[PDB]
Design a protein around this ligand. Structure first.
Ligand SMILES: *C(=O)c1nc2c(C(=O)Nc3cc(O[C@H](C)c4c(Cl)cncc4Cl)c(C#N)cn3)cn(CCN3CCOCC3)c2cc1Br
Length: 300
């Protein structure tokens, strides 16, 4: 039905759909096997993520997915974002074939890798040593910033940047997901809590929440929250604060406390990202440079 784009079009019969990975506001994502994604190796298998409409496919759902497809065609390729691999638009359901990140999103990745507690009996020479170390946490933050810097250069705004929207590959490479998506910014239920308990309003910059204004600097605010997530190892922001209290606290200019085991350098970065005036927050370019200095300083 849709026009054929030979640049991106991929034979749907070269896809083998597997287990569903997750579902969104519009569309669901399914793990799948792809054969010959590289045209030079037609019989080579690869694992990809296929986005498709749900079965309650309204025409707004289709429009949103078509919109996401066109954004993915224009955004180009970068190491630190989920890249478009191909599409299926001819003679069958609309598929958007994306890169697959084997380790899930950044939040789940961090939460599954919290250090062993003092309730465990010491076994071996590394009893206290957890999977996560400080330089790696800094690297994760750096990669997200680089990816966001790239998206900004392509004039793209995320509007819901969070640990849950950052994906982790087999090689622990950060990949920003669901970047320039329609998210119904004129009808957000600020009290809406997701199935996993997330309150997305806690990631919104004040100008976005109060004035419905989204800029790259509003993403920087969200990045600050993401920084806090990272160094709490997947903690939920504004701990124990319901949305009603969040409203008043934000109007009073309240900010999150410095989390435990977090160096003042990084909490400093967080607070800069949460400066009230968007122009007094660092740019993503400055965030990359600042995080680079820390990363190089702890990479002897
Ligand atoms: C394939 O590489 C692969 N992917 C995963 C994922 C996974 O999450 N893949 C994934 C999800 C994507 O988007 C969805 C909607 C999503 C989810 Cl499900 C969660 N949070 C954010 C988002 Cl955007 C996209 C996109 N776009 C791309 N890829 C999860 N797993 C398993 C996780 N974990 C593995 C081992 O420990 C137990 C469970 C996989 C596996 C694989 Br092979």
């Amino acid at each position: 039905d849709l026009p054929l784009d030979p640049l991106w079009e991929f034979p749907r019969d070269r896809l083998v759909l597997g287990k569903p990975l997750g579902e969104g506001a519009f569309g669901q994502v399914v793990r799948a096997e792809a054969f010959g994604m590289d045209p030079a190796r037609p019989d080579q298998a690869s694992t990809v993520a296929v986005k498709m409409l749900k079965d309650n496919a309204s025409d707004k759902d289709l429009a949103d997915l078509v919109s996401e497809m066109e954004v993915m065609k224009l955004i180009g390729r970068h190491k630190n974002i989920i890249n478009l691999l191909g599409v299926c638009t001819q003679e069958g359901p609309l598929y958007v074939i994306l890169e697959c990140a084997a380790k899930g999103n950044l939040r789940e990745f961090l939460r599954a890798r919290r250090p062993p507690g003092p309730d465990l009996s010491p076994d071996g020479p590394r009893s206290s040593e957890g999977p996560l170390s400080f330089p790696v946490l800094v690297s994760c933050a750096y990669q997200v910033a680089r990816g966001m810097q790239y998206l900004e250069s392509r004039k793209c705004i995320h509007r819901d940047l969070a640990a849950r929207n950052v994906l982790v590959t087999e090689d622990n490479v950060m990949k920003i997901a669901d970047f320039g998506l329609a998210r119904g910014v004129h009808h957000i239920d600020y009290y809406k809590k997701t199935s996993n308990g997330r309150l997305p309003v806690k990631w919104m910059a004040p100008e976005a929440l109060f004035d419905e204004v989204y800029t790259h600097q509003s993403d920087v605010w969200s990045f600050g929250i993401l920084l806090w997530e990272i160094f709490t190892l997947g903690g939920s922001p504004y701990p124990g604060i319901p949305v009603e209290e969040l409203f008043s606290l934000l109007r009073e200019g309240h900010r999150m406390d410095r989390p435990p085991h977090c160096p003042p350098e990084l909490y400093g970065l967080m607070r800069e990202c949460w400066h009230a005036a968007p122009s007094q927050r660092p740019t993503f370019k400055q965030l990359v440079e600042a995080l680079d200095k820390v990363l190089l300083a702890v990479s002897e």
